[PDB]
Amino acid sequence: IVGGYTCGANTVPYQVSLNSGYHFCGGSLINSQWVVSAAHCYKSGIQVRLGEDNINVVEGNEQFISASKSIVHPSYNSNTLNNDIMLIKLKSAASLNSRVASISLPTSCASAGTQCLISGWGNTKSSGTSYPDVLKCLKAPILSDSSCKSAYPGQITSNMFCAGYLEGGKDSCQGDSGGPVVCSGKLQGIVSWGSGCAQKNKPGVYTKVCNYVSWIKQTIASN
Ligand SMILES: [Ca+2]
Predict the structure, then answer these.
(1) Would the annotation count 33 as a binding residue?
(2) Of 1, 23, 77, 142, which sits most exposed with the smallest number of CB within 10 A?
(3) 131 CA → ligand 1 middle, Å
(4) Residues of the chain with a following break (C to N over 2.5 Å)
């Protein structure tokens, strides 16, 4: 997250870190046994880390649980990033409390102008590299589809939205991918892609979760 603020420990209780020896992507806890992330974060050997603030220090609220199954969306396209969404089943259920909690799926899609909260452990610089140990947060609005398509001609599908600031300076970044965009208490986006981070006229692009609720619910019910 570029241009954000330190969230505070366990203030984003649905945020997870995906770990394969190191943090590589975020995700969101949607019930006690399932996480949703970005398909481009797929790899084998995932440990899901719940209850994290500092990802390099054991602080006392963590739960570390291996994945048993990963399910990339049937229609994910790695070249265009269309359908950039993946479900991860935990080997055992997490213990839920005020510091480790699920986020609700949306019943309706959010409109442009709605303010959302984006969070992650990704790079904090638009030039160069500095990775934080503690969770960072950013408040940002959903942009109109017309603004989004004008920023990224030929690249925005109906399964994507832009959020952020056309003036730049505040955005998600590398290492935030897979993490949550929460608006009005519901999961509306997944950090997906952008051109650099925090550049003028290049806001972040997010997977539009409201298009996937049926697939998510059916998949959980059967797996
Ligand atoms: Ca920790």
Answers:
(1) no
(2) 77
(3) 15
(4) none
Q: Hey, what are 163's tokens?
A: 């959020």
Kindly provide the resolution of this structure in angstroms, with one decimal.
0.9
- Burial class for 140, CB neighbours closer than 10 Å (0-12, 13-18, 19+): buried
Q: Is 60 annotated as a binding residue?
A: no
177 is in an annotated binding site: yes
Tell me where in the chain the CATH 2.40.10.10 domain(s) lie: 13-102+211-222
CA atoms in the 13 A half-sphere facing the CB of 129: 2
Place of tokens 């994507």: 160
Task: Compute the 3-state secondary structure of the chain and give helix, strand, coil in percent, each to the nearest 5.
Answer: 10, 35, 55
Domain 13-102+211-222, CATH = 2.40.10.10
Q: Is residue 40 annotated as part of the catalytic site, yes or no?
A: yes
The whole-angstrom separation of Cα 32 and Cα 177 is: 22
